[PDB]
Amino acid sequence: HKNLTTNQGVPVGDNQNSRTAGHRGPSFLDDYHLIEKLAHFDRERIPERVVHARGAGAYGVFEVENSMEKHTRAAFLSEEGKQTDVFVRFSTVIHPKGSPETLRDPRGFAVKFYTEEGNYDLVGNNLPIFFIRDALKFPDMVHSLKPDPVTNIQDPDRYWDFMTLTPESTHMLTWLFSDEGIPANYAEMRGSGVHTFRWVNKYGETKYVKYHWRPSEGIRNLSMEEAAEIQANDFQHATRDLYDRIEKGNYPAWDLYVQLMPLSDYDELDYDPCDPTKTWSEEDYPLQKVGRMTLNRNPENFFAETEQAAFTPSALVPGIEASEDKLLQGRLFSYPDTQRHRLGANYMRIPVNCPYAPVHNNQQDGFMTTTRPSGHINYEPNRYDDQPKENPHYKESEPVLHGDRMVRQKIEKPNDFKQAGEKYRSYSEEEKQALIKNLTADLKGVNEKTKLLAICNFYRADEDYGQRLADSLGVDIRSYL
Amino acid sequence: HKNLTTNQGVPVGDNQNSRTAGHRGPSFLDDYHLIEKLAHFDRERIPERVVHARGAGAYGVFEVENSMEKHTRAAFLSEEGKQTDVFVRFSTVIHPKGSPETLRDPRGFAVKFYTEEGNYDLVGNNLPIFFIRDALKFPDMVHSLKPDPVTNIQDPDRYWDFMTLTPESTHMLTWLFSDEGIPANYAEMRGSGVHTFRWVNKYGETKYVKYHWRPSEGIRNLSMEEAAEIQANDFQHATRDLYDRIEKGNYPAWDLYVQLMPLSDYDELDYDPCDPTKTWSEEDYPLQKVGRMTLNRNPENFFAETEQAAFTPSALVPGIEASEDKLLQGRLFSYPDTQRHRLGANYMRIPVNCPYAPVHNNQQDGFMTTTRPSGHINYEPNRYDDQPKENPHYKESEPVLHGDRMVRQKIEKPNDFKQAGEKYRSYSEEEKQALIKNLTADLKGVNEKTKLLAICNFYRADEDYGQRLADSLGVDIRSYL
Amino acid sequence: HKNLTTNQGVPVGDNQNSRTAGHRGPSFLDDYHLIEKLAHFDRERIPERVVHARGAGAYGVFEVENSMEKHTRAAFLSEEGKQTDVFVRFSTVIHPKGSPETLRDPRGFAVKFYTEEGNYDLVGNNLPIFFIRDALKFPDMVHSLKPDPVTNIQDPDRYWDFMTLTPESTHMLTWLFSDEGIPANYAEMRGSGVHTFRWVNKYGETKYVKYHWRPSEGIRNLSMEEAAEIQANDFQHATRDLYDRIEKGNYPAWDLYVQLMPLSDYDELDYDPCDPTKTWSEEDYPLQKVGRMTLNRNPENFFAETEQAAFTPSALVPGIEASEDKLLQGRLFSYPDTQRHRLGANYMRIPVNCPYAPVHNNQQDGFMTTTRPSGHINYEPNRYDDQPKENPHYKESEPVLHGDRMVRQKIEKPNDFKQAGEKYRSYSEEEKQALIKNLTADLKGVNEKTKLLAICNFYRADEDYGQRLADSLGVDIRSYL
Amino acid sequence: HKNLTTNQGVPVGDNQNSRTAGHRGPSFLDDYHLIEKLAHFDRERIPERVVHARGAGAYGVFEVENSMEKHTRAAFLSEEGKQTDVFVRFSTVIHPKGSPETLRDPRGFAVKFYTEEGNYDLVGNNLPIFFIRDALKFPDMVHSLKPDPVTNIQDPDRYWDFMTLTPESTHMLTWLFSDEGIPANYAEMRGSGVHTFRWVNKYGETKYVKYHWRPSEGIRNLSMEEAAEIQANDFQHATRDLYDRIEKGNYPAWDLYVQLMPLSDYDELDYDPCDPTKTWSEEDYPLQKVGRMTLNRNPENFFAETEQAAFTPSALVPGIEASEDKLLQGRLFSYPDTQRHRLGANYMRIPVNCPYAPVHNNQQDGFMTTTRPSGHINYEPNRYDDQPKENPHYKESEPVLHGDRMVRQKIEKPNDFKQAGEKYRSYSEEEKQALIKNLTADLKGVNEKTKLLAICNFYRADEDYGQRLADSLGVDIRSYL
Numbered sequence A, B, C, D: 001h002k003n004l005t006t007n008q009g010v011p012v013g014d015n016q017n018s019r020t021a022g023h024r025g026p027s028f029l030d031d032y033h034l035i036e037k038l039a040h041f042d043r044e045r046i047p048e049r050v051v052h053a054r055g056a057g058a059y060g061v062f063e064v065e066n067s068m069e070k071h072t073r074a075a076f077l078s079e080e081g082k083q084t085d086v087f088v089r090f091s092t093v094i095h096p097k098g099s100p101e102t103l104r105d106p107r108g109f110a111v112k113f114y115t116e117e118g119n120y121d122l123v124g125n126n127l128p129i130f131f132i133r134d135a136l137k138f139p140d141m142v143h144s145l146k147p148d149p150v151t152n153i154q155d156p157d158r159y160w161d162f163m164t165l166t167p168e169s170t171h172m173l174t175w176l177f178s179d180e181g182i183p184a185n186y187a188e189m190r191g192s193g194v195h196t197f198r199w200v201n202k203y204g205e206t207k208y209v210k211y212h213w214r215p216s217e218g219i220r221n222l223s224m225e226e227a228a229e230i231q232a233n234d235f236q237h238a239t240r241d242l243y244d245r246i247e248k249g250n251y252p253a254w255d256l257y258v259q260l261m262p263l264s265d266y267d268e269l270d271y272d273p274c275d276p277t278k279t280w281s282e283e284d285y286p287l288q289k290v291g292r293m294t295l296n297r298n299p300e301n302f303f304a305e306t307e308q309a310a311f312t313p314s315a316l317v318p319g320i321e322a323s324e325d326k327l328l329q330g331r332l333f334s335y336p337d338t339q340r341h342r343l344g345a346n347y348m349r350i351p352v353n354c355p356y357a358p359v360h361n362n363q364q365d366g367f368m369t370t371t372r373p374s375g376h377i378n379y380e381p382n383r384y385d386d387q388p389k390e391n392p393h394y395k396e397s398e399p400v401l402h403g404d405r406m407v408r409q410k411i412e413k414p415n416d417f418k419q420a421g422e423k424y425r426s427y428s429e430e431e432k433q434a435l436i437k438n439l440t441a442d443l444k445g446v447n448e449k450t451k452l453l454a455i456c457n458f459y460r461a462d463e464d465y466g467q468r469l470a471d472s473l474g475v476d477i478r479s480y481l
């Protein structure tokens, strides 16, 4: 048994009735419990994430099967058997909190590893590529895909306008409009790092790496019809599924694989290996097994742990570095930037975001300082040998720059259509039919000029792809061939 | 033709490429356009409303048919033909911003009248009563109805626990579980002030008043099955429907009626006329036509106008005053309170919230001061005849207090069951079948003890109601009768 | 030895140099440590208190000498020898952080008692009365006294405009323009609760109470000349003094006394005993010793503990209640209100604000949720016996209301001038001279009409006081006499 | 004559009395005017600037005397006679908003030019160099100089610890401990850009440029004793002086001069021309007159204009670019960053901050959206020829990068002591005496080892400097010599 109390620790005598002039009269201002309780209610909500607002979290463990020390000095990957606690959030992308989990979208796949050398965030999606290759375009891309700013309804005429005029999107669209654009749930779903990262070993040698998560539960996707049926009865089916699996003891798991490429292979390829619109051939750069992640624990409070969770691709640990990918480069900034807004200057003290590794630095103050700070010395250099010092063992590498000037210029070898054509041709006939069906339903009402340009981009990827789409939309494209 | 610019008004040379070390190198910190564009994008979102997060807005006009000067000095009601501009937001209640408009819930019906004596907000719902009668219970009621704080899914076991232990909810539930708990859209929907207010005329005479909005399009509802069919294909059907009606010139309208009651009828009744769990008899207190509101204009920007709209029941105008309704009394506080959090201290300067009537006072400063203030004098009293002064013509009435002590006590004659029974009996057989169906689907999984208490509360309302529900749920209630 | 780390727990390899293109080139965006460090630095500051911005804090203990159980059931006062931890903040009033502590002003004297029945804040000042008697005037009073909104300099012509037109200020100004308007430091200074409160014993019997703190170090003040001498060399002399006393083991202390008055004495006094412009006679209501507060510990971190401290007069504990004082009644609302803005919705979880008594309630979420919440049940009533419940032993009293209407009306017996005259006459000749000197220096540059009305108010208090001031200012008052 | 109104535009009937239970009872919650008025009062304050919190603003005009088109394509400098409106804020640095203007500190000298090609901020100080040369050290430097985080008093032992271990500070300290560390006021004060910037002309040719403002009122400094004598009687003397000059029509003015250096002079020098701890010789790089700025208009409201003013060194206009100065590079980020926190995401819409040039871009939403946005198209590229487009005529230059790796490394030729010695020797004997006097008063109580290292740094600058200081401090340095 417990007393209901105010926030001052005073027990509440009556949690039913406001304080009033007799039994039916108007209310008094001197009702601290009423005002405190309403005022805190009135302040429950914080801004939702600007994208990936709808999602679900769980905790688990990552266990290494094969040490990666030949390629990275990352502590959490150093030894067979080594276990690292994770927190993972899965999500949709475009619509707000409360939106259905039956909509076409990439799905987020964000993993926070609580390592002995700091938190490592691998902030992935299910699909292995992206629509754009420079962060400068992200707000434009997002705005195009978001509900129209007048109507509050998503409009394919808007996002296809953007995408058609951004032909580097063609590969991504060739995946997103497969039925893998609507995963069945968060467990039966792929995971990808998307970007090339740099792995640096004990000798200082660097390789490029890509990360892949393969679900133990296999990949299951929904057709448009299957998605509609689920939407009719449950707008939160994936959130429900994840919680329920774990509550029943049916823990979902993913194997982690990497591809590795020498830096020197840039020069021989017909694409830029750090263009995130590109994959790497699994023939030429085979998947290498790293380990397994198992999610086995629901959070205790959805708001405090899942809603407040903060991931950033710049949360890198020794041995794992950013590549020069210009999309990634902007992410390094945007995540901690948004999070200071969404969660507060001290968001890294919120429990789910705290490292297991010790934190010692000269930062101070900010809204909601809860950490009981002490001491006179908040500056370095200082004369005190016991105060925190820099540690040169933990310097990052020094990537070689191939450019000579500060420029705003597209990467060389953009090669916008080739891989989209390869993906198309890798599709089974059924999968090619689903792709065309899903494209057609999406494009059939868009502006004719934008429609034609979409067809043209897909035709440039593969003639049979473009032509099939034209046939299905009833567009004759002979005069242009 | 126009230049794309920074916020400093500098034209942007390249909105495609970040600034980098050659065409494929990493990105530079000296890229003001990138950082400004991403930093603003990173800050687009503000907290959603704590309830009624999902909604849609329109502008229109209200026109008086019958002047109401005999009963209220309210300027906007003073002459036949008098037109007042309005802004209206409709909404659901419980789920977040992107949630479906096919869920069971009261619907919000919030009308802002831009009058010559200030803005008047009549913050209504479709249903004419409420679940509770004291604001002190609102955060509890809401928390019970909201998604579970661990799972992020609404749980009938939690809200029926609260409602069954809060038997004054029995009338509301008798309406909410009719098919009117899912209006077909926002146009074919009832509107109600819910609370009793006080109207005061120019002689200082007071009457109790209730407000009712009657849709020109008629009232139409959805069965559970009809709602699921809509949900399968559109999770923003009501938002879509409202925008489309107005865009095509098919403007939805409502007629405004009032009921009027003398304060001296309190002892005539077997309920408290200011208990918002109660309606008033239309036989004994007939509906009196006031005028008609037509919605004829969509907003230009959903975020700036609909999302940032701020209504409060305390935005009262001379001649229209609060009643003593303890639920209403807390609303007077909570709305401006939550708005200062959600929107900023200066939220009343956001265009949609601005009065048409002049504003002049001694308030100053606060985040985002955009109004070009001037002058030395920001205090009253002062020696300057030209500075703003109080105007005693605009004093509010002085309601008589019947109580002689500051108390926390339930009203007398709560009468929790009788009107629920009267409503039940007023239903057609088809409507009674829908009600029992809807209740049964909602109750069939809840804790048995809570299920029995639900049945008991409805049985106390009407024996046939309670027994039918018991029969439909398979609960034998013989031992209690 | 300790590593300097990022907030992610990664050790820092170089805390001297930004990451750049060669040893002298421009900076890269991929410098997480730079950006994290700068971004936190960029967010150190929170809004200063709207008043009392300049101040200093210490911890200590309060020990009861005489148990007060005959007059209040307050747990912390229930037994001889009972010790309660305190946190105290002293302050000036009008000027910002960084302003000198040699300015004329009331001094704040805010004491937070960490009791077994919750936190109790007694938010006092040194001087025992106030300028105004209704909270509606507070922002006007403050705006008049604050630096002019154009010039950013305080202007006596502004505040004397307000004060002269607010004659209830006359008693306060007769204290504030004694040399007690500049205490020598925070230790050699009076403390006062200012308002009448209600004390309620275990039989439910109520008395009016006033609180007084008497410094063990004596009361010492500064002339205008002595203040200027200090100001030349130290603008934080009182903060310095407090810290230095405690660091040296010279702990300052104050004895707590109360005056007690029966509620029934209202009716035969020639002033309202709950008018905070009035004191109570120490002959007719003698001071009764309660106990002693000793300050013996400096905070570990000024920002986290002193700057973020939050006191409210509405933080009352069982047995101690507000009176009807209309000034106090607004304070009940304003403090938690401003603190939610200044510090966050969860400001009551900042360590210095946390009670020692357990907190258990159904509030949730809000910015910077750091408390590791758990459980499914965040609403009451609920079916669970183990969840927090109200406790009727802790209900507040039910004060009798003497009025029968909701009114806006000044109190009866305002008696604006009599106690100002009594205070004047109680001064020594030297003290009278200082008063007239201090007033003259303040008034000599104000608008002539305002200057005359000041003189008139002081003359109404005492004809010698007013005539001496008129003579000292060179104002001929013959035509009025 | 005007009515006092609420923010809803309703005239206030009584601005003196709260609404209460009779004339002397407690206050009612239903008092919208009370609550709105207090709640706005409660939210007046915003965070002060993290440095340069104390300051004062004025408006004026900058007129070109000599067109600079041969060296920069900057539009505001393109023609003799061309006039540009400015806003200027002057400041101290370390202490908070209300702190005295008599303290030793650089003084801020921030100029916003409202040009036809966007706002250009030149965010200078009076002194022409800085303490440090890499932004990564700025939070350390500041934290050392700021009041101790326990005591809230500045401690020379803390900042001398930092500075002695940061010997690049030696030049700066040799200026700051001259009497120029305390300017007499803001009019009789130097101004400096401090950094090297890049000027780029219409042919794309780049020169390095340094900016200097020369007061029409001449330079006047205060001794420590003169500063104390002013501090005794006025803590806002420089704010007062500036307002009062302009109010009287005695408008202060500064002539703007530049020095210009070819990029190729790098190897001609024994320092780095982009090391902000260095000046350039006026013999070798003579001052060239550009024009004159006159301040002639005080602001209408100090909060709205001066307090909410936002300047950033990254507010550059075509033809003026950042240099590679690593201090400046961090500033490019930190200002807008801090401003988003201090003022809100939309701070660029606060009137003082708004450009005169048109702003058109695809940014949207954020707290306090007041600008009446409209339209469907908030993304680029898009198919609409009338929507804003990039303009290649306004591309920035492409500076050449000399380094071939991403490094963290000190510049070559840091040369920490030579220019400090040159400055020392340039001082008159009276100025040298003041310097030694000021240093000795500052150093006499610091840790002996720190004190000796200070002496050593100054001795390395000039033997006579160091020896005189050692003598004055009573430190025997024979035996290090």
Ligand code: HEM
Pocket: A048, A049, A050, A051, A052, A055, A089, A090, A091, A107, A108, A109, A110, A123, A124, A125, A130, A134, A135, A136, A138, A192, A193, A194, A195, A309, A310, A311, A327, A328, A330, A331, A334, A335, A338, A339, A342, B042
């Ligand atoms: C320039 C490109 C991108 C930018 C600028 C960007 C920016 C952001 C921002 C600001 C957030 C909100 C973070 C928060 O509020 O905590 C977010 C969320 C997210 N983004 Fe990105 N994003 C980009 C591309 C991508 C890519 C390529 C992926 C995956 C590879 C991705 C995956 C995610 C995920 C999974 C989340 C949700 C994190 C969570 O669960 O809390 N984004 N993004």
Ligand code: HEM
Pocket: C048, C049, C050, C051, C052, C055, C089, C090, C091, C107, C108, C109, C110, C123, C124, C125, C130, C134, C135, C136, C138, C192, C193, C194, C195, C309, C310, C311, C327, C328, C330, C331, C334, C335, C338, C339, C342, D042
């Ligand atoms: C209606 C009249 C008054 C109002 C509306 C008012 C309002 C406020 C507010 C809003 C603050 C800032 C609190 C914070 O941010 O934590 C404050 C501080 C303060 N007020 Fe008042 N006040 C009033 C009268 C008085 C009176 C009568 C006293 C003493 C009896 C007083 C003593 C103080 C003190 C000591 C502080 C500083 C507390 C601290 O150390 O943080 N005030 N006041």
Ligand SMILES: COc1ccccc1O
Pocket: B093, B094, B095, B103, B104, B105, B106, B145, B176
């Ligand atoms: C007030 O909202 C609700 C009522 C009944 C069932 C579901 C809800 O979301």
Ligand SMILES: COc1ccccc1O
Pocket: D093, D094, D095, D104, D105, D106, D145, D176
């Ligand atoms: C950065 O300015 C300072 C230098 C020396 C002493 C005090 C200061 O605030």
Ligand SMILES: COc1ccccc1O
Pocket: D452, D453, D455, D456, D459, D466, D477, D480, D481
């Ligand atoms: C050249 O060495 C020194 C000079 C002055 C003070 C201390 C030293 O170590």
Ligand SMILES: [Cl-]
Pocket: A361, A362, A363, C037
């Ligand atoms: Cl640090």
Ligand SMILES: [Cl-]
Pocket: B340, B341, C340, C341
């Ligand atoms: Cl707030």
Ligand SMILES: [Cl-]
Pocket: B361, B362, B363, D037
């Ligand atoms: Cl006002």
Ligand SMILES: [Cl-]
Pocket: A037, C361, C362, C363
């Ligand atoms: Cl609660």
Ligand SMILES: [Cl-]
Pocket: A340, A341, D340, D341
């Ligand atoms: Cl921010």
Ligand SMILES: [Cl-]
Pocket: B037, D361, D362, D363
């Ligand atoms: Cl843009």
Ligand code: NA
Pocket: B066, B067, B068, B080
């Ligand atoms: Na009429």
Ligand code: NA
Pocket: C066, C067, C068, C080
């Ligand atoms: Na006793």
